[PDB]
Design a protein around this ligand. Structure first.
Ligand SMILES: COC(=O)c1c(C)n[nH]c1-c1ccno1
Ligand SMILES: COC(=O)Cc1cc(O)cc(O)c1
Length: 208
């Protein structure tokens, strides 16, 4: 069944900032997730170096960007370490909760949002483009989970029953009505080339 959680009020508060503040340079939302995905392919390249039985859930280490116009969705799939329940529910909430304050202190004093990454809170970047985000993730030690939040204070998590994804994180952006420009191949290739040309993992932009 579906469990409902509340955001730590600092996370809540953040998500509003992102959602309601005027900021036109939204495309950066994507290199944050690319980057994030690289950070989770790093973690598992590394661990498998000592324990190669960790790759039994999938030898192949790659990023996939998937645009779906009919759904209004860009998913960023990745074969990374993945997230456990304790991750989704309590461990991420914890780290995120410092990243948030620093990021927000650093805001008057005129840093800005394209910098949310140097603060550990990149993932929340999605909220620039996404009206609801759905994380489908699969760790080696735990069950497969779906996390979802349309923001506004609360997130859900359930055990998934979709395609068994083997090991990874899929992040399905359910884009707002006026942001469909990131559903366009020509527009996705330009951001990748601009902001993520050095990611040491195969990035595959699916066409439609
Ligand atoms: C994949 O989505 C996430 O990365 C996530 C979740 C599910 N909770 N918190 C976070 C997070 C990201 C960055 N800092 O925190
Ligand atoms: C830094 O920790 C995290 O944010 C987990 C995470 C893993 C991933 O494969 C993609 C993400 O967007 C986030």
């Amino acid at each position: 069944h579906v469990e409902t959680f509340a955001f730590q009020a600092e996370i809540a508060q953040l998500m509003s900032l992102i959602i309601n503040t005027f900021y036109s340079n939204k495309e950066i939302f994507l290199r944050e997730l690319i980057s994030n995905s690289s950070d989770a392919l790093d973690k598992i390249r590394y661990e498998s170096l000592t324990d190669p039985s960790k790759l039994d859930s999938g030898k192949e280490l790659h990023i996939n960007l998937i645009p779906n116009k009919q759904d209004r969705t860009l998913t960023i799939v990745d074969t990374g370490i993945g997230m456990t329940k304790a991750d989704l529910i309590n461990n991420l909430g914890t780290i995120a909760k410092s990243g948030t304050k620093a990021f927000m202190e650093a805001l008057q004093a005129g840093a800005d949002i394209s910098m949310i990454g140097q603060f550990g809170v990149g993932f929340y970047s999605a909220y620039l483009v996404a009206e609801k985000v759905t994380v489908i993730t699969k760790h080696n030690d735990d069950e497969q989970y779906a996390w979802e939040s349309s923001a506004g204070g609360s997130f859900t998590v359930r055990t998934d029953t979709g395609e068994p994804m083997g090991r990874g994180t899929k992040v399905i952006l359910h884009l707002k009505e006026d942001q469909t420009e990131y559903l366009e191949e020509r527009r996705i290739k330009e951001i990748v080339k601009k902001h993520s040309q050095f990611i040491g993992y195969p990035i595959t932009l699916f066409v439609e």
